[PDB]
């Protein structure tokens, strides 16, 4: 390969890791690096913003532990009225409901915390401070977890304004997962217009934005004028 292709391969893997579903080592790493930055920043409102963000992810992490425990406790119940197919079918469906409803509340609590983290960052008014690498990384990570919390519950239209704010910050636009999620969420919205028989202007708006971020994700991972880039361009043209 070329030096740029080798570099690119390394970077795409780092970006996929960056967007990894949360776990205890990633929680540690993510907060450890966000911890580095707030230290240098030495700004009480940024300190508060991170305190709220971390409380939000803690809600998510505590929920993930709850979901395993709940499924465990259900698995360990002896189910005597479950001898016919439909009976097991029900109890599976109710397990999905209780888990989904609790995950929905955990998401709502996590987003209230993320909203508070953003409201505290909003109080940093000095443009010399808002342009700090410390400011931009935290604001990016708050948006990323917000996007992921909604994404996991299939709330894809809601991820669009946050993905769009995300890619505007400090070269986030060059992240392959960011464009993949934008393209997928736009695709969903296009399909919503087709299923609900909505207006053509919105059909084409969503289709256009899907194709822009589809092609950009392709360019970023495979390179301009790669067999894969050429393919997506030829489909669009």
């Amino acid at each position: 390969l070329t030096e740029d292709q080798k570099k690119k391969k390394k970077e795409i893997m780092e970006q996929e890791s960056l967007w990894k579903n949360p776990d205890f080592k990633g929680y540690n790493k993510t907060f450890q690096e966000l911890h580095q930055l707030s230290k240098t920043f030495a700004n009480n409102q940024f300190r508060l913003a991170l305190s709220n963000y971390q409380s939000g992810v803690n809600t998510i992490m505590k929920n993930r532990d709850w979901v395993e425990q709940y499924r465990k406790e259900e698995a360990e119940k002896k189910r005597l009225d479950e001898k016919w197919y439909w009976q097991k079918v029900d109890r599976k469906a109710r397990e999905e409901r209780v888990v989904y409803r609790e995950k929905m509340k955990a998401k709502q609590d996590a987003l209230n915390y993320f909203s508070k983290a953003i409201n505290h960052l909003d109080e940093i008014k000095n443009p010399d401070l808002r342009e700090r690498p410390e400011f931009k990384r935290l604001l990016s990570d708050v948006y990323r977890s917000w996007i992921m919390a909604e994404y996991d519950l299939q709330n894809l239209p809601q991820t669009i304004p946050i993905l769009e704010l995300y890619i505007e910050i400090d070269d986030n636009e060059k992240e392959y997962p960011a464009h993949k999620y934008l393209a997928s969420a736009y695709s969903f919205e296009e399909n919503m217009i087709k299923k609900t028989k909505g207006p053509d202007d919105m059909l084409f708006k969503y289709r256009y934005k899907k194709n822009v971020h589809l092609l950009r994700a392709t360019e970023l991972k495979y390179g301009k004028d790669s067999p894969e880039y050429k393919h997506i361009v030829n489909v669009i043209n």
Partner: protein, 184 residues
């Protein structure tokens, strides 16, 4: 009584001495991080009480180590100023200690109170001399005025070394050692 004070002060003079003898070893880091820790290599500069980070962190002529320690803001700083040049050999596993000319520390957060005042800056100008070097320790007091540890009544002088200065010497010498071990 005054006997207990005398023995305790002696133990603390030796505690700061033994750690200063370990701190003088961090020369091994010039030819060479733990979390919350940022190390810079540099040279004594300005008025001789502060350490200026090098443009070339790996440079063989660095004679000061500047370590910033963070937690939840910058909480502590230490500057180790060494007497003498470094060994020509580029391998840090072979490097030897250099008596410290000075140790300068700063406390920004986790401020300790000595008779209700904060000593935010401590300047030791004879860290590898006689353990009993209280007259060589300048104390910068906030409620920063300059006091000399040897003119501190004594418990007060004892509380200073056990609550403030030994802490920073041992906290920093360990954080420097972490960096060394991780890269060595």
């Amino acid at each position: 009584s005054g006997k207990s004070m005398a023995d305790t002060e002696k133990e603390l003079d030796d505690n700061i001495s033994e750690v200063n003898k370990r701190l003088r070893l961090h020369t091994v880091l010039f030819k060479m991080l733990p979390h919350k820790t940022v190390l810079y290599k540099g040279k004594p500069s300005a008025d001789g009480e502060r350490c200026e980070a090098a443009d070339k962190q790996e440079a063989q002529d660095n004679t000061c180590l500047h370590l910033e320690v963070f937690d939840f803001a910058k909480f502590k700083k230490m500057e180790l100023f060494f007497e003498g040049s470094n060994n020509a050999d580029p391998d840090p596993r072979k490097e030897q200690p250099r008596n410290l000319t000075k140790i300068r520390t700063y406390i920004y957060q986790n401020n300790f109170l000595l008779e209700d005042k904060v000593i935010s800056v401590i300047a030791d100008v004879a860290p590898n001399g006689e353990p009993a070097h209280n007259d060589k320790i300048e104390l910068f007091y906030q409620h920063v005025g300059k006091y000399i540890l040897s003119n501190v009544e004594n418990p007060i002088r004892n509380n200073f070394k056990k609550q403030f200065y030994f802490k920073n010497l041992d906290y920093f010498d360990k954080l420097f050692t972490k960096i060394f071990d991780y890269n060595d």
